[PDB]
Nucleic acid binder design. Structure first.
Length: 266
DNA sequence: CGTCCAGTCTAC
DNA sequence: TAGACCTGGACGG
């Protein structure tokens, strides 16, 4: 996922788990190379928050829960095929790699981290990844200042389309978003990042890094039924669209654009 | 059947 | 900077 998908997953976990109580341990698939989650409680509530491309679950035991346990935090990155689903306990999806089980009374459900390709990860810490910059969705002002204050950094030597994926500065921006952001301003994708950003300090490029992803969030849906995908496909103006050019950036990722490739094109 | 296509993370 | 990590769907022979 990118920022909007991670944000919508966090809203999903919060709304779906709102009136649920989990009990038991946290079960991992045998094939997952991520860590076993050392957690058990007779009664715990799960809630979520998103920051850029990361999602933090908090497991919160109720008063009196046994074994005595402090709340535990987990941070997930989704990679290419991560998601959360709420399913019936005995109809787990095929790649449900981490599950939380509701306690009785009611229908035994499973909250599942589902990741087909297993590019996603989780850590026990609870900390956000050091080096990821502020969330373009929820920390706009911190995100904007973190870029403008560091334009000397070598990251800004690269083409703008490459700098937009560097999660140190654009935490939450991925491939469709970089295309859609640059198309709104008709910025050539191989314009130099420092050139485009130096021309700041008018919705501008950094503002669009917040407002474009926010548009996706306001669509709703995107896994969180299938008509939700036509909603998103209709919103797109550039990424994958007939009549648009594509190039490979230097890390082999496809950038979609209109017109001028830009000076630093391969 | 085969190939090609869809974000880190780590070794050189 | 180049390959490593994975599965599945579209599509071509």
């Amino acid at each position: 996922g990118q920022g909007p998908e991670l944000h919508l997953a966090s809203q999903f976990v919060n709304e779906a788990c709102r009136a649920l109580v989990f009990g038991g341990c946290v079960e991992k698939s045998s094939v997952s190379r991520n860590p076993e989650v050392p957690f058990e409680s007779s009664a715990y509530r799960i809630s979520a928050s998103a920051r850029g491309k990361e999602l933090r679950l908090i497991l919160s035991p109720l008063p009196g829960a046994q074994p005595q346990q402090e709340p535990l935090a987990l941070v997930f990155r989704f990679g290419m095929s991560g998601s959360f689903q709420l399913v019936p306990r005995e109809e787990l999806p095929r790649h449900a790699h981490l599950r939380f089980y509701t306690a009785p009374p009611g229908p035994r459900l499973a909250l599942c981290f589902v990741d087909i390709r297993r590019f996603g990860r989780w850590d026990l810490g609870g900390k956000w990844q050091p080096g990821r910059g502020p969330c373009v969705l929820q920390e706009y002002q911190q995100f904007r200042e973190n870029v403008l204050r560091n334009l000397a950094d070598k990251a800004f030597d690269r083409p703008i389309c490459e700098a937009l994926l560097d999660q140190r500065f654009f935490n939450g921006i991925g491939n469709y978003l970089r295309a859609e952001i640059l198309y709104r301003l008709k910025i050539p994708p191989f314009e130099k990042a420092r050139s485009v950003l130096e021309a700041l300090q008018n919705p501008d490029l950094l503002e669009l890094c917040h407002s474009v992803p926010k548009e996706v969030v306001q669509l709703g849906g995107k896994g969180y039924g299938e008509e939700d995908f036509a909603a998103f496909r209709a919103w797109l103006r550039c990424y994958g669209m007939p009549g648009m050019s594509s190039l490979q950036d230097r890390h082999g990722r496809t950038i979609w654009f209109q017109g001028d490739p830009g000076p630093l094109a391969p």
